[model samples]
Target: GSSGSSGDQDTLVQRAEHIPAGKRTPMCAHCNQVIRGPFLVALGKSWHPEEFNCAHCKNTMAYIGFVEEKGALYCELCYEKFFASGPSSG
Candidate 1:
């Protein structure tokens, strides 16, 4: 998204923010926020290849991928509120 390859951590966040106003994913693997959209995968699964969570918050970060791909780094309530999947029908 930042025109840079993966591994550019800061640039990743920066790029996400630059996408207009509402077209950005604010997920931080270090924070555990639920993210939307595809992200540059980080290699952490090659070693474990299972599932891992944050040591401090116990929130799931990455699963099959790594700390940069799957899992919520900070959880929904920790950093930001997760959007409702759809409109409530009630």
Candidate 2:
């Protein structure tokens, strides 16, 4: 019973990678401005790709991809050099 409960907790964490963006209007994490049309959704927030620039290098994130640490977004190279110790799990 204890082993099964622990497994369930890990499963819960993995399953919540991204919440539904839904259609309910969201703010860009970068600028705190309202967004329209398509946007990137990750880390429990929505972002406009152009608005979500890497904090260290200032590169714009791709439409559906980015790395985040301490509430800031980063590009792959910048994240690897600055924040990542190993490959990301999510």
Candidate 3:
């Protein structure tokens, strides 16, 4: 299909993430954390967790699960060990 306008929007659209028919609000793959609703980032709509850490190691998070809610947002070891373990007191 041909878009009506040929502009920078095209470039952005190409790189932007579009929600699939059966996927919208999703969780952060790394921490299994809720993405919330509203916001935008390199990934797409910021409906999947405002912030996410390793959940195990507490390292910075990445990726998302807006489509399958099973995407990888953190390292494997971190995801399995630290997810939702609560903050450390030490």
Candidate 4:
């Protein structure tokens, strides 16, 4: 596994959302209400692009997809550490 410049880019990045007039609107699942300005669509619901946060670590997917346990949601990395691996290995 020794390549200099070649790398993987599966890691996620944040992108902001902007809605124009007459484009229509979607409601946030967390807020359980209508979205007025900028937002994100995830898990088939709307999140306010600013805080689709996980537990305490708040860099959201806004999802390439998310993981949910007990109805709580997380992006891939936190989901892996928080719920997927659990409390055994270090």
Against the true structure, what is every candidate's RMSD?
Answer: 14.9, 7.6, 12.9, 8.2
Clashes of each: 8, 0, 8, 0
lDDT of 4 by residue, 1-90 (tens): 766977777734233344543465787777767777767655556677666676546565654345666676666777666656777866
Q: Candidate 1 on 1-90: residue-level lDDT in tens?
A: 458655733322111111222354544444455445443233321111123344336544443111222543433333332332546679
Model 3 TM-score is: 0.22
* Cα lDDT listed for each candidate: 0.34, 0.57, 0.39, 0.61
Greater TM-score among 1 and 4 belongs to 4
Instruction: Please estimate how well model 1 matches the true structure, expressed as its whole-model Cα lDDT.
Output: 0.34
* Best first by TM-score, ranked: 4, 2, 3, 1
* Order of candidate numbers by lDDT, starting with the best: 4, 2, 3, 1
Per-candidate TM-score against the hidden true structure: 0.21, 0.51, 0.22, 0.52
lDDT of candidate 2 at residue 17, scale 0 to 100: 28
In model 1, where do residues sit more than 4 Å from their true spots?
1-51, 63-73, 81-90
RMSD in Å for model 3: 12.9
Q: Can you give the lDDT of residue 89 in candidate 3?
A: 88
- lDDT for 51 in candidate 4 is 62
**lDDT tens digits, residues 1-90, model 2?**
345534333211111123234555678776887766666676777767566566777775653245655666666666556554877679
Q: Write the per-residue lDDT of candidate 3 for residues 1-90, one digit (tens) a residue.
A: 766755443211112243443444565443555544532233443423235444335553344222112543444444333453766789
Tell me the deviation in Å of residue 34 in model 1.
28
True-vs-predicted CA distance for residue 45, candidate 3, Å:
16
List pairs with backbone clashes in candidate 3: 30-73, 34-49, 35-47, 35-48, 35-49, 55-82, 55-83, 56-82
Better of 1 and 2 by lDDT: 2
